């Protein structure tokens, strides 16, 4: 069936949208070529639509069916609990889209009478009406990017009302948090932290006689998901031991929301219908990971690749396996792509076999190596810095709910570009404005969190280790990239940052307390007469456990 159907009403913006980076003092400090940084707007919606509207093709074979039963089997060991309206509410973000029935995130969190009552009514309705499609809103997502040798058209987000959103949590939160791990095991990418991911990738790579690996990029994965996929995905869920209320709630959510439904723009007009994955639902991240895994796993048996190992994060896939030769490997990869195409997961960029792990990119990131004080090789997770910086620049000029930079510092603490530019730029500013105290919301795997800037040293040591404060002698590959990028975005050179960092460091050490800590470990790279960085007290006390369990992108989740 057609992924989407449009009535002709436009996808409209519920306010004014900014497309160009504003010229201000602070941002200009990070990067000069501001006219290269832009943000998507509903304006390009039409273009997106054309890219995602098409008629799917799907042919399931015995390998598909086989793997499904295999996955079903493990899922059947799971027992998911129901969530009280409280727990679910406590999980809703404060910025989350307000309800169209008279309440908002604020009220939902305050367990406000009006909110909780409507929520209660929506649940009751999911238990009674098993048919009626649930209404959803469509919006052109507004993200920041850098220009390229045109521009990326806005991404479309589909999401139900806050009422239906809380119920989803109640019926499926526990499910989408445990089930994936139980089903995919070592392959579930969200169970790992950057360091743990790197470890998994490097161990897998080494466990092979002669490694071969590739990243498979599906063309607009969501729109490729078919009504069959969603139903199959629900069947896995149905294997869990669930309360009747939840069993039915899930059954209803599947038929009324997940497999598809009506599209309403911000104005309130009917835009069309959806028959593919909705990006703004709780089951998006879990569902896409299950689906992608299912297809790829079966696709590897069809293509006859040997000893496949998958790493899946939603629609993001990377496979590592035993090579069979250059020629044979390209044939297998091609076979693989076709199998996946049959399964309704055609490629965007044709996959290319990789024999050098550092060259494989998944989750917009890759694996590289640097050295610690002792001088031994240390692998860490890194990525091209363009987007992070561009957004960083944008987040410096305008106030925005989420701070991609803070999240990036956290996830990329050990990288060259993260420590040299981001850490400096932002600490320098916070130091100026006197804001080191204020907490800031950010995101990890799609879930919002609230971190205090002055706690970064602890976070970084526990998630990466002390080496993240002393790495050096980065690969010539990584170095070239960073430099190439700064040159492109008009970002100040190495020396300029060192000088700036050298100054911030000083200003930080004078304030003492948690600040000196930041200045001591975070900017130790700047001073020549180094300092001995020892295990930080608060580090071995942080409950970062929950930070890396499952994915929630688009799932409207906030871990308080």
- Binding positions are 217, 315-316
64 interface partner picked from Mg ion, ligand 1NU, none, CB below 5 to 8 A per type? none
343 interface partner picked from Mg ion, ligand 1NU, none, CB below 5 to 8 A per type? none
**Residue of 230, 271, 482, 504 interacting with ligand 1NU (CB under 6 A):** 482
Binding status of residue 47 toward ligand 1NU by CB under 6 A? no
**Contacts to ligand 1NU from residues 517-546, by CB under 6 A:** 525
Q: List Cβ neighbours of 11 (8 Å cut-off, separation of 6 or more).
A: 42, 45, 46, 49, 138, 139, 140, 156, 265, 271
For residues 416 to 445, the per-residue mask of contacts with ligand 1NU, x marking binding by CB under 6 A and - elsewhere, is x--xx-------------------------
For ligand 1NU, which residue has the nearest CB?
Answer: 419
548 interface partner picked from ligand 1NU, Mg ion, none, CB below 5 to 8 A per type? Mg ion
For the bound state, the minimum distance from the C-beta of residue 4 to Mg ion, rounded and expressed in Å, comes to 16
Binding status of residue 474 toward ligand 1NU by CB under 6 A? yes
Helix, strand or coil for residue 218?
strand
482 interface partner picked from ligand 1NU, Mg ion, none, CB below 5 to 8 A per type? ligand 1NU
Give the H/E segment covering residue 520: helix 513-521
Binding status of residue 369 toward ligand 1NU by CB under 6 A? no
Q: List Cβ neighbours of 385 (8 Å cut-off, separation of 6 or more).
A: 415, 417, 421, 481, 482, 485, 486
CA 105/CA 258 separation, integer angstroms: 23
**8 A C-beta contact, residue 137 and residue 78:** no
Among 157, 152, 155, smallest CA distance to 38 is for 152
For Cα atoms 423, 426, 427, give the angle at the middle one, nearest 5 degrees: 75
221 interface partner picked from Mg ion, ligand 1NU, none, CB below 5 to 8 A per type? Mg ion
Output the known binding site for Mg(2+): 217, 315-316
**Residue of 483, 516, 533, 539 interacting with ligand 1NU (CB under 6 A):** 483
**Contacts to Mg ion from residues 42-61, by CB under 5 A:** none
**Contacts to Mg ion from residues 315-374, by CB under 5 A:** 315
Q: How many residues bind ligand 1NU (CB under 6 A)?
A: 14
**8 A C-beta contact, residue 458 and residue 538:** yes
Retrieve residue 544's tokens: 């970062």
Binding status of residue 494 toward ligand 1NU by CB under 6 A? yes
CA 316/CA 314 separation, integer angstroms: 5
For the bound state, the minimum distance from the C-beta of residue 141 to ligand 1NU, rounded and expressed in Å, comes to 31
**Residue of 221, 427, 445, 497 interacting with Mg ion (CB under 5 A):** 221
DSSP state of 188: B
Nearer to Mg ion, 262 or 346 (CB): 346
Retrieve residue 34's tokens: 């501001």
Pairing of strands 261-264, 136-141: parallel
Nearer to ligand 1NU, 150 or 375 (CB): 375
Q: List Cβ neighbours of 313 (8 Å cut-off, separation of 6 or more).
A: 189, 190, 289, 362, 363, 445, 551
Which positions touch Mg ion (CB under 5 A)? 218, 221, 315, 548
Q: Residues in the site for ligand 1NU, rule: CB under 6 A?
A: 416, 419-420, 471-474, 479, 482-483, 486, 494, 498, 525
């Amino acid at each position: 069936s057609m992924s989407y159907t449009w009535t002709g009403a436009l996808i409209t913006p519920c306010a004014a949208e900014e497309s160009k980076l504003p010229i201000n003092p602070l941002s200009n400090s990070l990067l000069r070529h501001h006219n290269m940084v832009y943000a998507t707007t509903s304006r390009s919606a039409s273009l997106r639509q054309k890219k995602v509207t098409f008629d799917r093709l799907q042919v399931l074979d015995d390998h598909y069916r086989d793997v499904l039963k295999e996955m079903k089997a493990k899922a059947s060991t799971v027992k998911a609990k129901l969530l009280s309206i409280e727990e679910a509410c406590k999980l809703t973000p404060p910025h989350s889209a307000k309800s169209k029935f008279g309440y908002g995130a604020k009220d939902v969190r305050n367990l406000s009478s009006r909110a909780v009552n409507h929520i209660r009514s929506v649940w009751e309705d999911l238990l009674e009406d098993t048919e009626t499609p649930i209404d959803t809103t469509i919006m052109a997502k507004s993200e920041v990017f850098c220009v390229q040798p045109g521009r990326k058209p806005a991404r479309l987000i589909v999401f139900p009302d806050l009422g239906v959103r809380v119920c989803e949590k109640m019926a499926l939160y526990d499910v989408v948090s445990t089930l994936p791990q139980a089903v995919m095991g070592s392959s579930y990418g969200f169970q790992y932290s950057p360091k743990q991911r790197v470890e998994f990738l490097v161990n897998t790579w080494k466990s092979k006689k002669c490694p071969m690996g590739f990243s498979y990029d599906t063309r607009c994965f969501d729109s490729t998901v078919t009504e069959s996929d969603i139903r199959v995905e629900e069947s896995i869920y149905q294997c869990c031991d669930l309360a009747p209320e939840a069993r039915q709630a899930i059954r209803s959510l599947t038929e009324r929301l997940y497999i598809g439904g009506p599209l309403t723009n911000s104005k309130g007009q009917n835009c069309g219908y959806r028959r593919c994955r909705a990006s703004g639902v709780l089951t998006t991240s879990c569902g896409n990971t299950l689906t992608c895994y299912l297809k790829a796993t079966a696709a590897c048996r069809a293509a006859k690749l040997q000893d496949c190992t998958m790493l899946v994060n939603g629609d993001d896939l990377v496979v590592i396996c035993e090579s069979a030769g250059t020629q044979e490997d390209a044939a297998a990869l091609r076979a693989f792509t076709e199998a996946m195409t049959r399964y309704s997961a055609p490629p965007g960029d044709p996959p290319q076999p990789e024999y050098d792990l550092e060259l494989i990119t998944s989750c917009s990131s890759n694996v590289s190596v640097a050295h610690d004080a002792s001088g031994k090789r240390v692998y860490y997770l890194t990525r091209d810095p363009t987007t992070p910086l561009a957004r960083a620049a944008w987040e410096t000029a305008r106030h925005t709910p989420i701070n991609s930079w803070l999240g990036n510092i956290i996830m990329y603490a050990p990288t060259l570009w993260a420590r040299m530019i981001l850490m400096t730029h932002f600490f320098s500013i916070l130091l100026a404005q006197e804001q080191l105290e204020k907490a800031l919301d950010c995101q990890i795997y799609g879930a919002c969190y609230s971190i205090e800037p002055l706690d970064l040293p602890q976070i970084i040591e526990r998630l990466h280790g002390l080496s993240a404060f002393t790495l050096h002698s980065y690969s010539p590959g990584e170095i070239n990239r960073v430099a190439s990028c700064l040159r492109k975005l008009g970002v100040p050179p190495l020396r300029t940052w060192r000088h700036r960092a050298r100054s911030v460091r000083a200003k930080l050490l004078s304030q003492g307390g948690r600040a000196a800590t930041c200045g001591r470990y975070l900017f130790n790279w700047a001073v020549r007469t180094k300092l001995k960085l020892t295990p930080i007290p608060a580090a071995s006390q942080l409950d970062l456990s929950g930070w890396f369990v499952a994915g929630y992108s688009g799932g409207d989740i906030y871990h308080s």
